[PDB]
Amino acid sequence: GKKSKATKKRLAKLDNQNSRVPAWVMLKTDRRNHKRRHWRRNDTDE
Amino acid sequence: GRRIQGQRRGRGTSTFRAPSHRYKADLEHRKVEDGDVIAGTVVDIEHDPARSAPVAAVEFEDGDRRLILAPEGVGVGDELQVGVSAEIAPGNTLPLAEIPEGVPVCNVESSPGDGGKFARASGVNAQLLTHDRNVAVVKLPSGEMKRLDPQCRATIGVVAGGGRTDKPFVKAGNKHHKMKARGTKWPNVRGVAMNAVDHPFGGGGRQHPGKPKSISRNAPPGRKVGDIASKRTGRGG
Amino acid sequence: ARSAYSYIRDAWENPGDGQLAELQWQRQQEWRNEGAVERIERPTRLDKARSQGYKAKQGVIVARVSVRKGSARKRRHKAGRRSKRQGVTRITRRKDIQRVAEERASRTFPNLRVLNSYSVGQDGRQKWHEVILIDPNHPAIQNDDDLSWICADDQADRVFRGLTGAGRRNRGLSGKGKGSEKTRPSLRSNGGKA
């Protein structure tokens, strides 16, 4: 495929959202990233 | 039921359209103010996709380069004339009034200045019979006596490509190629071979129209199939 | 004495006789060659226009509109219907042509508001009406004691809601007594049975 600049920005954002809930948020809230996506198992938009 | 093929046609979808983007030109006569001071030279003979006949490219005095409905016997270099005073020779156009009686003509206008409507197909021709100050009588290719305005322009001679019809297609593939150059859906499936839902003749154990084929002129589209308003049928009588 | 206006009025009581007859025969030739909505500098029927609220003033516009004659232009049912709902040819619409004319005119002049309209004849295939529209945003009108009312917000797009004189008549609101049981205060509030 050929991604436009905008498509590319969205793809990047999705990649970033794909990170884990920081460890400190665990302690602070004293005890999951519900939006964890996999390139293979999932399908993004567009 | 479902609309019959004749009804699908009218919507003018791609399947039924003519390959217009591939057609060359509209072979209408030139428009001359008057005087006939318009002559051109045949610069080339080309194939006309829309008619399976040859057409001639002409370069006129005033610089206009246009394709023309060519009669038989026209070649490169030859000079053609178009006007009231044009010379009476094959390939020249002028109003019927100027044409001598008993002269085969082609690409005859229906209404003076329309560019030509009659006798344009391969090897055909209209026959100028009677003259007058009010009406020119022409015998069209179908054998019909047509009364025309003497001011209707025409081209002397018969259309090129005559005899085209004398040779059989022999193969389905040859029909195929010609059909691809026309606004026609081909091949043809018989009405009697379809399901009742698709045609008045469809249905039934064995194939056969379950009704007389001669249909009334007043029949609505979808029903007007078979032999339309036939005055008679068969070969007998 | 008689106003000069009464003579225009009187001429139009019989648009098919007298001088008016020859004028129409002449005019219509030009009208048939004009568009659907043509703005005109002056009303063809002055008496009627002034009578309906017209004034020679900034913000007052007049436009002649033509519409095809006859009944509804409807498409036959593509799905099953009982004989009753299969009709196609003799079914007419519920809005008269004058009302259709008023709406087209108002669409052409999105910023103007329909004040009133009147008939200027017809031929065998169409009808013409002239519509008076007002500019609610022009001060010459915002300051007019007889027309400033049309500047209120609730008067916006009045024609599209049937607030016109032709609108009100067509909605069966003329009668104040017998016969208006299902028209007043609105066709809708009465279940659409008027």
């Binding site: - | - | 004495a1 106003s3 000069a4 003579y7 225009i8 008016l20 020859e22 004028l23 002056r42 002055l46």
Partner: protein, 119 residues
Amino acid sequence: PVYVDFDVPADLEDDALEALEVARDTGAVKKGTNETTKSIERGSAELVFVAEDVQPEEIVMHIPELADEKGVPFIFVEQQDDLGHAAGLEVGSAAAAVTDAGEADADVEDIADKVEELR
């Protein structure tokens, strides 16, 4: 044009407007189709002018016949704005009426006569 049954010569039209101009400075004149109309009806009119470039024509179609059944003479002017100017207006005038001339009676009289002849 539908109410016009005869063409008036540019020269005659010239004299008329001149007469009308002095008529307002001397005698009395009515400006406007309505006022012109009531004058003919009240019979207080001697000469009425009617522009020929009036659109719509309904505005003045009645002047001709109304004047005939009232004896009041009338003349045509090619342009609407000239009549208005001659009548002393800053705008145009579809019709005008000299309600009793003023030091122009002699001319207005001739003009009326020149018309009757012109049929």
